[PDB]
Every structure is written in C-alpha cells, then in structure tokens.
Amino acid sequence: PQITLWKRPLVTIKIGGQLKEALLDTGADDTVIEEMSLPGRWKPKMIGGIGGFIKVRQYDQIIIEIAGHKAIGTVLVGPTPVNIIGRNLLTQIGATLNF
Amino acid sequence: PQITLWKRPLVTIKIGGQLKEALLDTGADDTVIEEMSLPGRWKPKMIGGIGGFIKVRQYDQIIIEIAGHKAIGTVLVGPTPVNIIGRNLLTQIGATLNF
Numbered sequence: 001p002q003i004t005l006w007k008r009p010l011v012t013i014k015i016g017g018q019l020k021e022a023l024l025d026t027g028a029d030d031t032v033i034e035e036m037s038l039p040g041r042w043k044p045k046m047i048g049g050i051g052g053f054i055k056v057r058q059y060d061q062i063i064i065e066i067a068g069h070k071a072i073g074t075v076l077v078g079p080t081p082v083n084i085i086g087r088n089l090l091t092q093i094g095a096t097l098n099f
Numbered sequence: 100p101q102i103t104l105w106k107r108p109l110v111t112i113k114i115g116g117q118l119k120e121a122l123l124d125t126g127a128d129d130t131v132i133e134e135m136s137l138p139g140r141w142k143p144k145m146i147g148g149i150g151g152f153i154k155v156r157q158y159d160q161i162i163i164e165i166a167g168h169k170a171i172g173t174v175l176v177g178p179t180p181v182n183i184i185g186r187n188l189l190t191q192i193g194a195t196l197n198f
C-alpha cells in the first residue's frame with residue numbers, strides 16, 4: 001500500500017495467534033509491544049525516547065505478521081504507551097518513505 | 100526521493116533561521132524540536148512518549164524547510180532527545196509510507 005499520514009498509520013499485527021493494533025513508526029529503531037507472553041528466553045534492554053527510559057524484555061526471532069506481511073525478528077515487550085513497529089521490522093516488510 | 104529504513108531517516112531542516120538535523124517520524128503526531136527561540140505567541144503543552152511526559156512550548160504558524168520542501172504548521176519546542184518531524188508537517192511535504 002501507499003499510506004498517507006493525515007491519520008496515525010495504524011495497522012493490525014498478529015503475534016502469538018492474536019491480533020493487535022500497532023503504529024508503523026519510522027522514528028523507532030526497534031519494535032516495542034505492550035505486556036504479553038512470548039516463548040523462549042529474553043535479554044534485558046533499557047530504552048529511551050521523550051520523557052526518558054523504560055526497561056523491556058527482548059525476545060529474538062519471533063514470528064509476527066504486520067498488515068498481512070510476514071516477519072521474523074526481535075520484539076521488545078514492556079510498558080510502552082502504544083504498540084510500535086520499528087525499523088527492524090519495517091525493513092522486513094519492504095517499507096520506504098517517499099516524497 | 101525514496102528513503103530506505105536501514106538507518107534512521109534523518110534530514111536537514113531549516114527552522115527559525117537555523118539548520119538542524121531531524122528524524123522523519125511517522126509515529127509522531129506533532130513536530131518536536133530541541134530548545135530554541137521562535138517568534139510570536141506560544142502556549143504550554145504536555146506531551147507523552149515512551150518515558151512519560153515533557154512540557155513543551157507550542158508555536159503555531161511556523162515555516163519550516165524539510166529536506167528542501169517548505170511547509171507551515173505547529174512546532175513544539177522543549178527537551179526532546181531528538182528533533183522529530185511529525186505527521187503534521189510530513190503530510191505537507193507529501194510524505195507517504197510504501198510497501
């Protein structure tokens with residue numbers, strides 16, 4: 001698709017067999033999702049933006065579908081105010097910015 | 100242009116007679132710039148992101164040049180760790196996300 005930016009670029013994702021809403025976020029290096037259960041071991045990450053730092057759980061090699069497009073990669077889980085799809089996964093779906 | 104997302108989508112802006120580096124940020128509703136003087140009236144605003152809220156000054160009807168494209172809109176000024184061009188100005192330069 002070609003997504004204009006008059007409204008938030010919200011899409012449906014699927015992770016752990018469940019559908020969620022998430023923001024396609026070119027300003028995010030990494031993908032950050034609200035609290036949920038994921039398989040396997042996690043590693044720590046302390047991450048920053050406006051307002052300061054959150055601690056998250058890093059899960060690698062997670063199957064996730066974004067707007068119908070299949071990706072497998074790193075998902076950070078923690079107290080984010082919104083689910084954000086960052087560049088690590090936007091690159092897997094072939095996304096570019098264009099003007 | 101077409102901007103890939105392997106790296107942060109940083110561009111040069113001109114604002115308030117100053118050149119700055121800023122992130123093209125589809126996950127930002129508004130444009131938020133580090134501390135600087137701008138002319139005219141402002142009002143305070145609280146904005147939230149990953150780490151909680153910061154206080155900013157809201158300036159309306161500010162001209163900006165973003166990677167050579169002129170726009171006008173609201174600019175929020177305050178203690179952001181990165182200058183971010185949000186959707187309010189990305190729309191005006193015709194930016195889309197494509198995949």
Ligand SMILES: CC(C)CN(C[C@@H](O)[C@H](Cc1cc(F)cc(F)c1)NC(=O)C[C@H]1[C@H]2CO[C@H]3OC[C@@H]1[C@H]3C2)S(=O)(=O)c1ccc2nc(NC3CC3)sc2c1
Pocket residue numbers: 025026027028029030031032047048049050080081082084086122124125126127128129130131146147148149150181183185
């Ligand atoms: C600030 C920017 C540089 C980084 N961020 C993305 C940004 O797009 C956020 C998304 C967001 C939307 C929202 F709704 C709430 C929210 F909490 C977060 N947007 C705003 O903060 C903008 C604000 C202000 C502008 O107007 C409105 O729009 C939305 C709000 C609001 C007021 S980040 O989330 O902090 C982030 C993500 C992944 C990540 N990965 C990393 N990896 C490590 C480095 C190796 S560091 C890192 C940081």
Ligand SMILES: [Cl-]
Pocket residue numbers: 010011012013066067068
């Ligand atoms: Cl979708």
Ligand SMILES: [Cl-]
Pocket residue numbers: 072073074088089
């Ligand atoms: Cl990844």
Ligand SMILES: [Cl-]
Pocket residue numbers: 105106107
């Ligand atoms: Cl980078």
Ligand SMILES: [Cl-]
Pocket residue numbers: 152153154178
């Ligand atoms: Cl503050």
Ligand SMILES: [Cl-]
Pocket residue numbers: 171172173187188
């Ligand atoms: Cl505006």
Ligand SMILES: [Cl-]
Pocket residue numbers: 004193
């Ligand atoms: Cl348009």
Ligand code: NA
Pocket residue numbers: 138139140158159160161
């Ligand atoms: Na003004």
